[PDB]
């Protein structure tokens, strides 16, 4: 309805939050974080079981995930095992830090939005009180301030914080899959049989968050 839309209020909230976040993050970092969130929302993380099946299917022969694609490309390049381990660990740590800082950006947005909503409703209350002769026509003048507060609360609780939590969850899943792929490529380079590695691979799948599934 038109009683829940206000250009000035959304301008105050979004402009204040953006200005405060830009104090601690460059614009390129913010765009990178938004790209991270979009990729983590639109694309689904590959199942670890599917990755294990693909690894054990490709082990005896000697493609969807780009990490294993770069792993097999480097294996064809025939680098030393130390080089493989270093490159894979560096990529995993880079992805981990990238997701962590995306989460930090979105948590900063979520923590800043309600304070800006409170500033906006303070401005609305001052504007209402400066134009009151009798306490009769102060309905919408309060509704706009409460609208600013509601915008702040909604953006903080249902838009930015859920994105940060989803980013953390996606970081955990990506770390798990990256570790599985790294172990698989190490085993393939070693040349061991497909079955022996699967004996110890599945012990730690249900780590931390997944501990509740069993």
């Amino acid at each position: 309805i038109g009683m829940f839309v206000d250009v000035t209020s959304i301008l105050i909230v979004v402009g204040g939050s953006i200005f405060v976040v830009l104090m601690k993050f460059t614009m390129g970092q913010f765009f990178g974080a938004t790209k991270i969130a979009g990729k983590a929302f639109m694309f689904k993380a590959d199942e670890p079981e599917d990755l294990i099946a693909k690894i054990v299917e490709m082990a005896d022969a000697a493609i969807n995930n780009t990490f294993m694609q770069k792993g097999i490309d480097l294996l064809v390049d025939g680098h030393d095992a130390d080089v493989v381990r270093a490159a894979l660990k560096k990529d995993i740590a880079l992805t981990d830090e990238r997701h962590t800082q995306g989460t930090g950006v979105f948590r900063a947005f979520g923590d800043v939005a309600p304070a800006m909503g409170m500033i906006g409703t303070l401005v609305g209350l001052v504007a209402m009180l400066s134009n009151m002769d009798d306490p009769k026509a102060i309905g919408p003048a309060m509704a706009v301030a409460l609208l600013t507060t509601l915008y702040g609360a909604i953006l903080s609780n249902m838009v930015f914080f859920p994105i940060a939590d989803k980013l953390s969850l996606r970081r955990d899943q990506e770390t798990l899959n990256r570790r599985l792929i790294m172990d698989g490529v190490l085993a393939i380079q070693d040349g061991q049989n497909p079955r022996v590695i699967d004996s110890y691979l599945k012990n730690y799948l249900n780590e931390g968050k997944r501990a509740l599934e069993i």
Binding site: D111, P114, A115, M118, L122, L125, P135, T149
Partner: protein, 46 residues
């Protein structure tokens, strides 16, 4: 805990409650409007 903006919000809302109670303490309510409001509220709550 909770962010301090929540504490500032609570303090400001309590202050506005005190002020509005003062404003109402010397105002007269229209009886018909109050009856309509009472009927609507009673219907809304069951």
């Amino acid at each position: 805990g909770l962010p301090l903006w929540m504490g500032t919000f609570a303090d400001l809302m309590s202050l506005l409650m005190c002020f509005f109670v003062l404003l109402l303490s010397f105002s007269e309510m229209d009886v018909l409007k109050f009856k309509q409001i009472a009927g609507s509220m009673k219907f809304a709550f069951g």
